[PDB]
Amino acid sequence: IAFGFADRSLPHFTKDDFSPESKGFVENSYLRGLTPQEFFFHAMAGREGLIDTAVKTAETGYIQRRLVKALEDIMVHYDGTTRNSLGDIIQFLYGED
């Protein structure tokens, strides 16, 4: 957990405190319950996960669209070769086996 405040993670800590509790170690379990500081740090981490899930899916879909458009015209032919729409050879035998 970065020092979002000046030299501390939260305003309930002192400056330049590198202990596990200051920088986001949650000592409790879910059964026992998180403290307010631990609750906030775990919320930051879950928010990071939600942002990642929301934002990476667009890059992934773009990548898969580009791959499909690049490889869409490639078919195994009756002579065993793997050719594109221009008839150009990509592999003389599919998968080399």
Partner 1 sequence: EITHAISSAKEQVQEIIYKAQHNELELKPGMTLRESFEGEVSRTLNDAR
Partner 2 sequence: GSPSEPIINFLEEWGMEPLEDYDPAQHTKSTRIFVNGVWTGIHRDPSMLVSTMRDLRRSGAISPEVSIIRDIREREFKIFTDVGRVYRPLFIVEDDESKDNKGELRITKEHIRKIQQGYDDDVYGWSSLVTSGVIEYVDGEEEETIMIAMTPEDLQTRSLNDTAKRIKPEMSTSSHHT
Partner 3 sequence: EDNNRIISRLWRSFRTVKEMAADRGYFISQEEMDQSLEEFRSKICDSMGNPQRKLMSFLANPTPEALEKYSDLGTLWVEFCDEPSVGIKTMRNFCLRIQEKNFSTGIFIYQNNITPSANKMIPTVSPAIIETFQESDLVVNITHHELVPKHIRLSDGEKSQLLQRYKLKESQLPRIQREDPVARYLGLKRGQVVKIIRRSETSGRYASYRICL
State the residues that interact with partner 1 by CB under 8 A: 18-20, 25, 27
Binding region for partner 2 (CB under 8 A): 5-6, 11-12, 14, 17, 19, 21, 27-28, 32-37
CA distance 22 to 31: 22
Nearer to partner 3, 45 or 93 (CB): 93
Task: Give the DSSP letter of residue 91.
Answer: E
95 touches partner 3 by CB under 8 A: yes
Coil vs helix vs strand at 95? helix
Q: Taking CB under 8 A as the rule, does residue 59 contact partner 3? A: no
| Rounded-to-integer distance, Cα 69 and Cα 24, Å | 45
Take residue 17 and report the two structure tokens written for it: 């405190």
Say which entry of partner 2, partner 1, partner 3, none residue 83 contacts (CB below 5 to 8 A, set by partner kind): partner 3
